[PDB]
Amino acid sequence: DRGVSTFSPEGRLFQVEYSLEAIKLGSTAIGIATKEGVVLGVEKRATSPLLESDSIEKIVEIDRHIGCAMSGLTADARSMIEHARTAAVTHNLYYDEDINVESLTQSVCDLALRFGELMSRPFGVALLIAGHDADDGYQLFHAEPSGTFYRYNAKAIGSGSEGAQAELLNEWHSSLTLKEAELLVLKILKQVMEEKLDENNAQLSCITKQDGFKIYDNEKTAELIKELKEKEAAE
Amino acid sequence: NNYDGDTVTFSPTGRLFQVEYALEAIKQGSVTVGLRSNTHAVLVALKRNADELSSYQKKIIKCDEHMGLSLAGLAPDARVLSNYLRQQCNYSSLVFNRKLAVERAGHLLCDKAQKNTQSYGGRPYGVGLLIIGYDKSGAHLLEFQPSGNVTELYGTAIGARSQGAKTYLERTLDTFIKIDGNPDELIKAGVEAISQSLRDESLTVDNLSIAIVGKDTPFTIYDGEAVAKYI
Amino acid sequence: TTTLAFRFQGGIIVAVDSRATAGNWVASQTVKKVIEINPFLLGTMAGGTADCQFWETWLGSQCRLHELREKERISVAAASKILSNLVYQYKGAGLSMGTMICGYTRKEGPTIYYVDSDGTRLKGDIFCVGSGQTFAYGVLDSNYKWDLSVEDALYLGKRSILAAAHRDAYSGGSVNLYHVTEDGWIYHGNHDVGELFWKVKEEEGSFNNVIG
Amino acid sequence: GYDRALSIFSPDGHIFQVEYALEAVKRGTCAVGVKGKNCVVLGCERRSTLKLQDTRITPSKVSKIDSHVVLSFSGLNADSRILIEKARVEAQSHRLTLEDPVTVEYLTRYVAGVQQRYTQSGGVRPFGVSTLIAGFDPRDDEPKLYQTEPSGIYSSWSAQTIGRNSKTVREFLEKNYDRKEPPATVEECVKLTVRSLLEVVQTGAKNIEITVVKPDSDIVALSSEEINQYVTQIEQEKQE
Amino acid sequence: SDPSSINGGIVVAMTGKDCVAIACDLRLGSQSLGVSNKFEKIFHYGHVFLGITGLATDVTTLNEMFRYKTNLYKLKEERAIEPETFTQLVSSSLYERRFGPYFVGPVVAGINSKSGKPFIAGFDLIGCIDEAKDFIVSGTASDQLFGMCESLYEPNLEPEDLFETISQALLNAADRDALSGWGAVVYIIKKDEVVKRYLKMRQD
Amino acid sequence: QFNPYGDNGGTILGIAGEDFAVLAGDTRNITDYSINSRYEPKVFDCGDNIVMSANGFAADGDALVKRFKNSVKWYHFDHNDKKLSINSAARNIQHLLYGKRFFPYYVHTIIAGLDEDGKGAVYSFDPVGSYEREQCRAGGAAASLIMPFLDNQVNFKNQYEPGTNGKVKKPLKYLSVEEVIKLVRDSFTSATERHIQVGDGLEILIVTKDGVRKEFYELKRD
Amino acid sequence: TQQPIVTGTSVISMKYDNGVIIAADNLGSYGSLLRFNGVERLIPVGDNTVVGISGDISDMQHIERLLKDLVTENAYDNPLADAEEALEPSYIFEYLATVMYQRRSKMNPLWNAIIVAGVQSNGDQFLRYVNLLGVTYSSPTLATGFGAHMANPLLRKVVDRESDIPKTTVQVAEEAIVNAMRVLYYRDARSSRNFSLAIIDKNTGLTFKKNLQVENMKWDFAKDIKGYGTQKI
Amino acid sequence: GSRRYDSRTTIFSPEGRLYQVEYALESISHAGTAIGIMASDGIVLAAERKVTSTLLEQDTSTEKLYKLNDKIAVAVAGLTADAEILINTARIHAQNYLKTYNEDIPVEILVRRLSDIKQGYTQHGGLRPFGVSFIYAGYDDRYGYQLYTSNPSGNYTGWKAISVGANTSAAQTLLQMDYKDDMKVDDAIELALKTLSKTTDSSALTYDRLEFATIRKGANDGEVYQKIFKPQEIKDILVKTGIT
Amino acid sequence: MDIILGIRVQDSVILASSKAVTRGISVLKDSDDKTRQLSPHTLMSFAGEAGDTVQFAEYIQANIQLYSIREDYELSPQAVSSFVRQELAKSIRSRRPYQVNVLIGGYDKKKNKPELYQIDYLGTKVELPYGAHGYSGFYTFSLLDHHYRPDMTTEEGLDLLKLCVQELEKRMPMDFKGVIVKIVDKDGIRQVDDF
Ligand SMILES: [Mg+2]
């Protein structure tokens, strides 16, 4: 056939480029970083009405000060989360402190290119890693299967990403409140989702310095959806 | 064609296509410039962002107090190679109480890259590196290719549109080599060199990345408002 | 050393002394012999100081990983067994450890496990470990009731360490008190034995053998 | 050792070996899971192409992982034994170290993890198996039902089916299962499970297996006659 | 401390005219404490008989091992193993543990099914074969057994005379050993009949 | 039989002030009854405003300091040039020491610096990595001669206010850097008089928000 | 773990204003048997370093080969091997010190005491000690074995502290070293009369002196000594 | 490198089938027919040797029927050499169990173990599967008389009567027609030989082309006897049942 | 730990095991249950070195429970004891052997017979009408030799056991803080809460 670690004539790794196509088929995940916190939101996308949607876990806690959202082949993310959690806890054991969000992200990204003929293929999932530390404040990173990670003020991944990113381009400014960010994620998710957005097929979460990482209740999100509907009808 | 399926295969004309494809990844990468005088050595790098919400990808990595490099191509491969350099610089200091010579650092990178080009299963590194350093024989600048070829130079550039900066340095050779004991003027020459590779975009405050090492100057990286002085 | 822990109506009381010795030489009077594994779990330190420190901080890391994975507070049974299984792997190598893993959960209530470096793991109501354990047991056994108040239980633990600190040459310095509730442990201060002895002697009428 | 990467990405971002493993599941006999208010029922299809079978000794389709959790499957039979064995060992290992039996979710997460591992390990192919895992958590009376598949993804279901013609029986369940009021009794839950299989099975004879799991490790498999009484009552109501 | 004399016990084997006899005591102990009076030390695999003295856990382990090996032998060879062949198998098996041995004193007895020739053999704990014509002894009262056998034995004894000789050799040897006794068994082996007799003896 | 351990003598002393910290140690290195060196530095600046000394068997002492200095370097590489806080350094050293739990570094380690609130900090380690933050700690040969003196003169132990006769303790008033250095010098002068392994020279490293400063003083050479 | 078999005794050394001096006798003892009389225990590395070794001779010969290999290795792909990138005394010492400590840490030591004497690139004097335990220390005077007990006291009377180094000439330093070697010959039962001496000076370079002998010895007073107390004849 | 020559023995087809397993089953369909029939008082194993010669030493020959222990036997269909590898593994497993628990291995536990070994070759290792199908005939004190079959996939099932090898479709129909639950061993012996006689590709069924075995409690009192029939004994039972 | 006794009567097996747990100088606990249920009709009591006892017992328990689930069948007492013996016989030649002695009391539902097996840490197995480990036999066996009958009732077995415990409490130097008694019969395992 051909090597798993083969370069294309353009200078790209075939397998990495193909895994990026799998991520495009994944459900939408959005992140927005503000000076009051970082918000993470996902499309759940249940394949049937009999599937209990609260068992769909696409937003995950890595540590008290670091959360994570996923898009793509979500089964691949489990070992990445395990590593992230272990890295966060291990660093606290060795240094009696919280680990930097960038350092955590870098540790996760080191796994990415460990494939060949180590694991047999790259990961088929992208991650939005959000968190807070004392040195660089609130941060949002985008971790890819290439091993590259970019910091973002706001970022969308998954099937509705380029439409969502264009929307984030217009809406983000450096003075956004946490409440404004919450509504903004809900607004853009509602735009790119196939099904009509409600508290059962979408999920919100945030990370603040005071309270740490929190996944929002369906009752709490339902109120923010109702607040969104009214303010869009307000003009 | 039929001989590019892996790194272990020569073509009928004696070419290694997988290595050549790895070389291509560097050409897609963002431009970075290296140049030196007799007292100092400078790296200038144009950082690339994903979009307007994203950060600008870092291009320069410190290896020791007296050595460091800039990258162009696959960033994770630069992390692997720079980590190896950090260890080799560190081994030399711990075991021999000796700062690793820049020339010897080049030899080590060459040999590490070579093993990936002669064995089955592996792949070549997909990154080019510009190593600067100040050791017991003064200032040095090296250019690393993932084929294994390492070359000591007065100045150079790698990445997209690097040919413009390389021609400028070839003209300015006699001028910038004489910039001794003046760090600011040597950086100016580097910023003017990398400007010969820009199109449509210009050097902004979060776009530019500069590093310097010299006689009484530890390897230090300048980003943000620290490079506004040179814009 | 003298460390104790006992279950009662209001949860768990943990009380320890503060002295560390190298032979006859008193190395430290300010040793923290209660390890704060996390906000809900406590461990006591007897035997090897490093062994207890190192492995009970490690235990805290394992407990944190458990609740991240399982989205639920680790049980005292499970937490104690992680430690006892670990030290059992090292059995023969020379680890020295005698500890009480203390916690208060919904499913268990207040629970104490004595964990040992020979691999022993015992659930119980009252435990007492160290060179001055026999002195503290005397005061505990004769005054313990399940229906003690939090105030009286705290004093009993304090008084039992004082009894050991007085008689045992290798116990003393100061007394550290903790009260473990379901919502977490609460620290109840550092009490210098020197000042505590005279205070207790006067107020209680005890230690008539000693001139004050 | 044999290290060949069998599960790899294609230009369109698909892992064909994982997708072809799903095709093996499609071929397997139908399995269905329905949870009531205080029970879960696992129904399984037995293809009647094989008679002269000894039903006493032939491997049954539903397997106990522990005294409180069961596992049924659709797909390759030989592959399923490997997952069942691993799950049974992990269930005992959990009891040994945590001093508490596994939650249904934990056991599902473990099996799904094994399945995922076989999709990016060298020299191995994915499991041609999807599983339905059902039971009750220790000291809990809330019914649990989970599904896994070759890719390693898993999720909870009010009711679910896998295997051949599972599209048809899922159609039935989606219109017949009400979430606001699930089958209140064992009878109602078994009846709805047999009804769903009768959409696909053929003869209601030895082709339907039913296993009822109740709280506190109360697991029993219904016999031919007991199931035959459900089959009889369903069609007599249908003649109207 | 000495593994070969913790549990105690003895085995003796003799040859006669067209017959062999093997016998053992029934005691198992923990040094001074008597634990069992039903611990038989003679086993058989087909028509080949094996007595084992020494550390009881090894006696059990080796019996289970030789059952294992003779069963596989029979499946592959399509015939029962012979005494001469089995003797070599015991020797091989013991020597493979040269530097971590089973603390035992095995004794083989049987009649070759093809030649009809009576056969006995003994081993040390490490596999050295003692193939005597007359008798083999083993266990904590081996000295006593050597004394009894050397005076009582005569060649070509008939089966029912050999029984008396081997029985009296065992009994009187065991009565001079603190760690042997508590009952005894004697096997009288002919080409196609084997008789097993439990002996009445003092229980101290 | 080969004995992998030795004793190079020496004595060290760490004291934490209100907004400063000192780590002192004599400069004499010995084996048995011989002097190897009258000036062999024992207290080291490890970067990030941390000073360290690993007293006892000098080979293990040098090895540990070397490895910690190396750990500071790699902490910067791995975590974006973040400053290693004194509490984080302490926990890191525990793991270095416990890593050789079954073939220990035969040393008594002390580090000093400032905590994240800018207050003075001293941490003390045993050979296998048990550690604690302390206000006052002497280590090495003459530790038993120095600590009782420090209990009395730094913490005012057994001292009461005149006229009250035992009823009121002497209040624990804060000491200046000049006051601490006086107590350090007198501790080592007294130790030199009564301990044969202590002498030659005294080197003190002082840590403040401004950085690390050194002071040297002669000690008796007999 | 082993025991030394063939052994070399004291190595002595000291700093002076422009460089360092090091010396060691030419004996290889086999217990109390003075077996080998032509053993060189000072081994020069380049023109700026001399490594003096005492203790086990088989291990000395191993270390000698390591240093020979170190010079070969340093010259590989090194155009400045005889200039800026030549081996320094500090490089040679640190390498040996690493090896010694690693070997003790595997419970298989090189049974030696080593003194590295040399002059650095900037003209600075280098003098440092390392032994089988990996213990290292520096001083204006250094000596191994018996030298530590007898030579150091004499050498310290010339250079007692750092400030005495610039005041000490090469003639005074060599005189002190040669006298110490005589004292060691009087008093060390495992010493010999024949020795080697090396001077490493920042101006005149490396001077290596072989086949030196202890001379000007006082023995005449022995004729008057009779008995062990009361004997007169 | 080496990848070029790799057949990839452990992959799914687009339809979700294991190529090599399917092709191994095709191989087995050309092997001599083996039949197993379970009765109330015992089990019968009958099997046809493949086109033999007059110079073949039949009385010392064994290609079809093998003994795993005193209670369990197998009939083989496929590559004889592959079967012997697995047979020796099964014999060891039975002895391991006996040593551990001091009880004879239950039939299903042995069958599952061999079947799991076959399965492993289809999922990992990159090796070809075993081209063998077994009929297991055995007895234990839990389920009594049992018949199983396993194939290269590692899947196994229980049977009252079953065939493997050539003409299984024709053989299984004939068995399904004449089999009854209250049947006895002597009746099952006759059914097995009659079925082979009708399905055989040879002109006539003779003693030199057959291997035969019975597992009976026709052993003196509560115990089980295996009987591998001798050439003369197969000749007699052929006359008794009226086939020759 | 210290004293563990066993007696097989007509229709049941009775295991008695001390409650004390002494760590050197102090008695840390006086209510310790030195037994594990391997299967519904099989009980194992144990005594030996600290840590190793419980570690071994739970390891065996896990293995038997695993077998029970895999086969949907309870192993006979004989089979379980043979498994346990092999584990100990393997253990004795290990780097660090299990220092554990056990008694296995089971009711065989197939044969309708109680069975008592005694196995020491070397892997020395014996089936007995009554058994013990350590010094327990030295005090009790003379009483059991005298009074024991194979046709005893469970109540008579308990009375003979009381006489054995009384003799232990009289002549043994150590205070073992009484015993926990458990009965194994056709209906399973139950504890005698007053003894
Ligand atoms: Mg002194």
Q: What is the DSSP string of B200-224?
A: S----TTTEEEEEEETTEEEEEE-G
What Å distances lie between residue I40 and A116, B29, C204, I4, I14, CA to CA? 51, 70, 56, 21, 15
CATH architecture of I1-195: 4-Layer Sandwich (3.60)
What Å distances lie between residue E77 and B112, E70, E72, E74, E80, CA to CA? 59, 10, 8, 5, 8
Q: Look at phi and psi of residue F82 and say left if phi exceeds 0, alpha if psi is from -120 to 50, else beta.
A: beta
- Give how far A190 is from chain H: nearest CA, Å: 37
Chain B CB contacts of G93 below 8 Å: 97
Chain C CB contacts of I33 below 8 Å: none
Q: Are strands D129-135 and I35-39 parallel, antiparallel or unpaired?
A: unpaired
Lookup: tokens for F157: 């132990």
Cα separation of I182 and I105, whole Å?
10
Sequence-distant (≥ 6) Cβ neighbours of residue B6 within 8 angstroms: A2, A3, A6, B18, B120, H1
The nearest alpha carbon in chain F to B95 belongs to F66
Consecutive H or E run containing H209: none
Contact with chain F for residue G102, Cβ under 8 A: no
The Cα diameter of chain H in Å comes to 65
Closest by Cα among I150, I83, I78 to I109: I78
Distance G145 CA to ligand 1 centre (A): 23
Distance F145 CA to ligand 1 centre (A): 13
Q: Scanning the structure block, which residue is given the tokens 């509490």?
A: F87
What Å distances lie between residue H145 and F168, H36, H91, H141, H142, CA to CA? 95, 12, 19, 9, 9
Cα separation of I99 and I103, whole Å?
14
**Beta carbons of A213 and A38 less than 8 angstroms apart:** no
Cα separation of A6 and D8, whole Å?
13
B87: three-class secondary structure by DSSP: helix
Instruction: Compute and round to an integer the Cα radius of gyration of chain E.
Output: 16
**Beta carbons of F54 and F64 less than 8 angstroms apart:** yes
Consecutive H or E run containing D70: strand D69-75
Chain H CB contacts of B120 below 8 Å: 1-2
**Beta carbons of G207 and G201 less than 8 angstroms apart:** yes
E187: three-class secondary structure by DSSP: strand
Question: Long-range contacts for A201-204 (Cβ within 8 Å, ≥24 apart)?
Answer: A201/A43, A201/A44, A201/A45, A201/A46, A201/A53, A202/A41, A202/A42, A202/A43, A202/A44, A203/A41, A203/A42, A203/A44, A203/A56, A203/A58, A203/A59, A204/A39, A204/A40, A204/A41
Q: Domain range for residue D98? A: 1-240
Chain C CB contacts of F94 below 8 Å: 50, 53-54
The CATH number of the domain covering residues in G1-233: 3.60.20.10
Cα separation of H103 and H71, whole Å?
12
Closest by Cα among F28, F14, F142 to F90: F14
Residue H11 to residue D24, Cβ atoms within 8 A: no
What Å distances lie between residue H142 and D57, H73, H161, I71, CA to CA? 11, 17, 20, 11
Phi first, then psi: what are they for D30, rounded to 5°?
Answer: -70, 140
Angle at E175 between CA E170 and CA E177, to 5 degrees: 95
**Which of G73, G93, G94 to mutate: most B Cβ within 10 Å?**
G94
What Å distances lie between residue F158 and A94, F146, F150, F152, I75, CA to CA? 39, 16, 12, 7, 72
Cα separation of H155 and E196, whole Å?
49
The nearest alpha carbon in chain G to F29 belongs to G137
Neighbours of chain I (3+ CB pairs under 8 A): C, D, E, H
Query: What amino acid is encoded at G151 in this protein?
Result: A
Residue A13 is given by DSSP the state B
E and I: number of Cβ contacts within 8 A: 32
Residue E180 is given by DSSP the state S
Lookup: tokens for A21: 């196509």
Provide the residue count of chain D: 240
Residue G110 is given by DSSP the state -
Closest by Cα among A221, A205, A148 to A29: A205
Cα separation of E171 and F105, whole Å?
66
Distance F23 CA to ligand 1 centre (A): 20
Closest by Cα among F27, F8, F15, F57 to F220: F27
Decide: residue E159, CB within 10 A, 0-12 exposed, 13-18 middle, 19+ buried: middle
G81: three-class secondary structure by DSSP: coil
Q: Kindly report the number of other CB atoms within 10 A of residue D95's CB atom.
A: 19
DSSP string, I10-62: SS-EEEEEE--EEETTEEEES----EEEEETTEEEEEEESTTHHHHHHHHHHH
Sequence-distant (≥ 6) Cβ neighbours of residue B119 within 8 angstroms: B7, B8
Q: Scanning the structure block, which residue is given the tokens 């010259």?
A: G75
- Give how far B150 is from chain G: nearest CA, Å: 13
Q: Scanning the structure block, which residue is given the tokens 């002068």?
A: F189
Lookup: tokens for I153: 């009732």
The CATH number of the domain covering residues in H1-244: 3.60.20.10
Cα separation of G59 and F172, whole Å?
59
Consecutive H or E run containing B193: helix B183-194
Interchain touch D–I (≥3 Cβ pairs closer than 8 Å): yes
Cα separation of B192 and B204, whole Å?
14
Cα separation of I48 and I68, whole Å?
27
Residue F4 to residue G133, Cβ atoms within 8 A: yes
Chain H CB contacts of A117 below 8 Å: 3
Residue C124 to residue I49, Cβ atoms within 8 A: no
Distance F196 CA to ligand 1 centre (A): 4
C111 has catalytic annotation: no
Neighbours of chain H (3+ CB pairs under 8 A): A, B, D, E, I
Q: Kindly report the number of other CB atoms within 10 A of residue D155's CB atom.
A: 21
Edge-to-edge strands, sheet with B138-144: B60-64, B67-73, B127-135, B138-144, B150-152
Query: What amino acid is encoded at E170 in this protein?
Result: L
Taking the CA atoms of residue C59, residue C63, residue C64 and residue C66 in that order, the dihedral angle to the nearest 10 degrees is 140
What CATH class is the domain E1-204? alpha beta
Residue E124 is given by DSSP the state -
DSSP string, I123-192: --EEE-SEEE-TTHHHHHHHHHHHH--TT--HHHHHHHHHHHHHHHHHH-SS----EEEEEEETTEEEEE
H and I: number of Cβ contacts within 8 A: 19
Provide the residue count of chain C: 212
Interchain touch B–G (≥3 Cβ pairs closer than 8 Å): yes
Query: What amino acid is encoded at B60 in this protein?
Result: I
Instruction: Compute and round to an integer the Cα radius of gyration of chain C.
Output: 17
HSE of B2, CA atoms in CB hemisphere, 13 A: 3
Closest by Cα among G44, G92, G59 to G196: G44
Cα separation of B73 and A10, whole Å?
12
Lookup: tokens for A81: 């989360």
Distance F190 CA to ligand 1 centre (A): 9
Question: Which residues are paired to B167 by β-bridges?
Answer: none
Give first-to-last CA distance, chain G, whole Å: 53
Residue I75 to residue H101, Cβ atoms within 8 A: yes
Residue D128 to residue H12, Cβ atoms within 8 A: yes
Cα separation of E116 and E109, whole Å?
13
What is the set of domains in chain A, with CATH numbers? 1-235 (3.60.20.10)
Q: Scanning the structure block, which residue is given the tokens 């268990």?
A: C108
Domains identified in chain D, total number: 1
Kindly list the domain boundaries of chain C, sorted by start residue.
1-212
Q: Domain range for residue F23? A: 1-222
What is the set of domains in chain B, with CATH numbers? 1-231 (3.60.20.10)
Decide: residue F162, CB within 10 A, 0-12 exposed, 13-18 middle, 19+ buried: exposed
Q: Which of H67, H99, H102 sits opposite E75 (nearest CB)?
A: H67
Query: What amino acid is encoded at A16 in this protein?
Result: V
Resolution stated for this PDB structure, in Å: 3.0
What CATH class is the domain C1-212? alpha beta
Cα separation of A100 and A132, whole Å?
8
Q: Kindly report the number of other CB atoms within 10 A of residue E154's CB atom.
A: 11
Question: Which residues are paired to I182 by β-bridges?
Answer: I15, I191
Cα separation of A104 and I101, whole Å?
50
Chain H CB contacts of A1 below 8 Å: 3
Edge-to-edge strands, sheet with D63-64: D63-64, D69-75, D129-135, D144-148, D154-156
